[PDB]
Amino acid sequence: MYYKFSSFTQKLAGAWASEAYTPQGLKPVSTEAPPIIFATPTKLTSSVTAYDYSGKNKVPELQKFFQKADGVPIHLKRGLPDQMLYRTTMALTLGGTIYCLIALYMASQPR
């Protein structure tokens, strides 16, 4: 009736008796209103590395890196570069296979 937490700057502004000290309504029950959600369905997951730059051993901190429960297979676990050379490897072997079949079909026919 004196102060209510509001005003988008996190401040105790001034409100009314039915606005500050009765934030609930005078409705009987929760009526057949349109439903609510505050949940982004993007399912975004961020994994931090947080490694050490010294110690000259570097195996136990790669051990921490590869023991993760992301569900990713270990040949896409490094992130960018393994995905890059896996994509290029599979692309060049598909191109090589189709050019191999084209070469074999061209060699099957005579001149």
Partner: protein
């Protein structure tokens, strides 16, 4: 600067906003910043550091947009992102 001086002093009227400022200052800053220190921090704010800070925070950023209601004329994210910068400054 004058509007911010009036905003910082005019809010601390009575006991309840002063107590709230004390509580969240000891919870966030770790200390209660006095109003004289607030004026002292306001004092050296001039135009070139204001535009430097605003270019650091507003210029060429990806914003977050929320909308509710008849928002069928609310532009796409490309138009808002393109309006976040200028072509020739």
């Amino acid at each position: 600067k004058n509007i911010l001086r009036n905003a910082l002093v005019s809010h601390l009227d009575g006991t309840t906003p002063v107590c709230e400022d004390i509580g969240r200052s000891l919870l966030t800053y770790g200390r209660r910043i006095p109003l004289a220190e607030w004026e002292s921090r306001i004092q050296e704010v001039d135009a070139q550091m204001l535009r430097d800070i605003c270019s650091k925070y507003f210029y060429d950023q990806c914003p977050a947009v929320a909308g509710y209601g008849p928002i069928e004329q609310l532009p796409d994210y490309n138009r808002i992102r393109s309006g976040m910068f200028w072509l020739r400054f």
